[PDB]
Amino acid sequence: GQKIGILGAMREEITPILELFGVDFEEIPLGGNVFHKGVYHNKEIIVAYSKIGKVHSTLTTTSMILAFGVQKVLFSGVAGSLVKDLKINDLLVATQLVQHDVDLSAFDHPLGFIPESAIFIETSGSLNALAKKIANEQHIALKEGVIASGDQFVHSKERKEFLVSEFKASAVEMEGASVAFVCQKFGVPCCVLRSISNNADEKAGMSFDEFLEKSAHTSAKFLKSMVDEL
Amino acid sequence: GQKIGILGAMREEITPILELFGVDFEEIPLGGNVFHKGVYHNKEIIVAYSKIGKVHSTLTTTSMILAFGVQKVLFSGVAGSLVKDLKINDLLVATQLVQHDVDLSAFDHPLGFIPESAIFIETSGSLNALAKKIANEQHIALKEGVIASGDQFVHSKERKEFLVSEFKASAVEMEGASVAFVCQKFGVPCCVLRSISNNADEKAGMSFDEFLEKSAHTSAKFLKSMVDEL
Numbered sequence: 001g002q003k004i005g006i007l008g009a010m011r012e013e014i015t016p017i018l019e020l021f022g023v024d025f026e027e028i029p030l031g032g033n034v035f036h037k038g039v040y041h042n043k044e045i046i047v048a049y050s051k052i053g054k055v056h057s058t059l060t061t062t063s064m065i066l067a068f069g070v071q072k073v074l075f076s077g078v079a080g081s082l083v084k085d086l087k088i089n090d091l092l093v094a095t096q097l098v099q100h101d102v103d104l105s106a107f108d109h110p111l112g113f114i115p116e117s118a119i120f121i122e123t124s125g126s127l128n129a130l131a132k133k134i135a136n137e138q139h140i141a142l143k144e145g146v147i148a149s150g151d152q153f154v155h156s157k158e159r160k161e162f163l164v165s166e167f168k169a170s171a172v173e174m175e176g177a178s179v180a181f182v183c184q185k186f187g188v189p190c191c192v193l194r195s196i197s198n199n200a201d202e203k204a205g206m207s208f209d210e211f212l213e214k215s216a217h218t219s220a221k222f223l224k225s226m227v228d229e230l
Numbered sequence: 231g232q233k234i235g236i237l238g239a240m241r242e243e244i245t246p247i248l249e250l251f252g253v254d255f256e257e258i259p260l261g262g263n264v265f266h267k268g269v270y271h272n273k274e275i276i277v278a279y280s281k282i283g284k285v286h287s288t289l290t291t292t293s294m295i296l297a298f299g300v301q302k303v304l305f306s307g308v309a310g311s312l313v314k315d316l317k318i319n320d321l322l323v324a325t326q327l328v329q330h331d332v333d334l335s336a337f338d339h340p341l342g343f344i345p346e347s348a349i350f351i352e353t354s355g356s357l358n359a360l361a362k363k364i365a366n367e368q369h370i371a372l373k374e375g376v377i378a379s380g381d382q383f384v385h386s387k388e389r390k391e392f393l394v395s396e397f398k399a400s401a402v403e404m405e406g407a408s409v410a411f412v413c414q415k416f417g418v419p420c421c422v423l424r425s426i427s428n429n430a431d432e433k434a435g436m437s438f439d440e441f442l443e444k445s446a447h448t449s450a451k452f453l454k455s456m457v458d459e460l
């Protein structure tokens with residue numbers, strides 16, 4: 001079958017992935033990352049955590065595509081909620097992503113926009129539709145919405161209000177847009193899956209720590225259930 | 231000789247490079263970029279502009295290394311000055327670079343710091359020393375200092391004051407840190423060269439436009455003079 005890249009940002013997001021697949025993994029170092037290469041149900045799977053933020057995740061995604069030849073990329077990890085209906089532990093897939101910290105307003109560009117690019121980055125409608133069917137069959141909620149990504153941990157009402165007002169974002173994190181961007185440039189299907197671990201408000205640091213393990217597992221379990229249908 | 235990658239962020243930064251080398255270039259598309267491949271003085275040179283900002287430049291640098299096998303990367307382009315002694319048209323090389331917009335302060339991390347990384351990214355002391363010797367021999371100034379990179383065009387006294395206070399930066403731009411970061415991860419020597427086109431203040435947009443062509447040429451000429459010694 002088609003070779004699948006599986007990414008998280010932090011080690012804690014991929015430890016449950018490696019465990020859930022349960023196969024032998026070969027560890028391959030490249031570019032400051034460790035890639036775990038295995039075979040699962042007649043598919044080659046390549047798993048890594050990128051390290052946090054846009055530069056790290058851009059690098060790792062580019063390596064997955066150029067050095068390992070992955071044919072699709074699935075991202076799993078944790079995020080901050082920007083909307084009341086996304087509770088702690090809830091899942092969402094990103095229909096579109098934006099780099100919320102991009103600002104070329106000095107030249108009258110819309111926030112998020114860079115010349116020769118676009119504000120919103122698209123993901124795979126097929127993979128998102130698959131996620132929604134699996135969630136419906138598992139009888140669990142799954143939101144489909146905009147994820148905002150930037151190189152700051154968001155933990156204030158004011159920044160939340162900006163993200164909602166400017167981009168109508170549903171969640172915030174630090175890698176999705178860059179992963180999805182790289183995949184679009186190389187024509188590789190991508191799905192960005194997140195489980196909420198905090199509300200991106202003044203208490204978000206403490207919530208992040210409280211729920212990292214559970215929310216990371218929630219996302220990882222759901223990602224595995226997608227791979228089982230691929 | 232050793233294969234050299236040459237990067238700018240914008241087309242206007244590489245047009246003078248292609249012209250100055252004056253050789254036949256083959257255009258090769260990959261990942262949303264166009265790479266110009268030529269031979270100059272027994273060296274293969276690969277020239278591209280990345281498009282603006284951290285994600286674009288991370289992607290392109292990673293492609294240069296993984297897909298084209300470059301053995302060193304030289305970046306040329308324009309920047310905003312943060313220090314009085316860096317005038318319009320003046321050159322600097324980055325001794326160290328920082329991602330000035332990275333903020334994980336919610337977890338008590340220093341600004342600029344990401345777990346499993348470092349605030350400052352190093353460049354090649356050999357290439358920087360070469361630049362300084364060439365500048366001394368050409369009888370022109372060359373500053374050696376910290377460059378701050380982020381995904382915003384900086385055009386305010388307040389943000390300038392932050393960059394100077396927090397990082398002791400000499401100039402600001404949107405790609406150097408990410409280029410240098412990728413090169414460090416892959417063990418590839420890097421030099422980031424910039425010519426000042428504005429003062430990163432409230433008038434910076436208009437200055438940027440006034441001096442883009444000249445400052446881009448100033449940097450490009452100097453980069454060519456480095457390649458001539460390699």
Ligand SMILES: Nc1ncnc2c1ncn2[C@@H]1O[C@H](CSCC[C@H](N)C(=O)O)[C@@H](O)[C@H]1O
Pocket residue numbers: 009010052053078079080081152153154155172173174175197198199200201204208334337345
């Ligand atoms: N409120 C929020 N804002 C930004 N990113 C968030 C977030 N909630 C979760 N994330 C995601 O989780 C990570 C936040 S940074 C976590 C740092 C960690 N506590 C440490 O100190 O080492 C990023 O990978 C990001 O994508």
Ligand SMILES: Nc1ncnc2c1ncn2[C@@H]1O[C@H](CSCC[C@H](N)C(=O)O)[C@@H](O)[C@H]1O
Pocket residue numbers: 104107115239240282283308309310311382383384385402403404405427428429430431434438
């Ligand atoms: N004051 C400054 N702040 C941030 N980047 C700057 C800068 N001065 C020059 N740069 C560099 O020049 C570019 C600024 S963005 C330029 C956008 C352009 N005027 C347009 O509208 O299409 C980036 O590649 C950046 O690295």
Ligand SMILES: [Cl-]
Pocket residue numbers: 153154155156159
């Ligand atoms: Cl915030």
Ligand SMILES: [Cl-]
Pocket residue numbers: 383384385386389
């Ligand atoms: Cl500013």
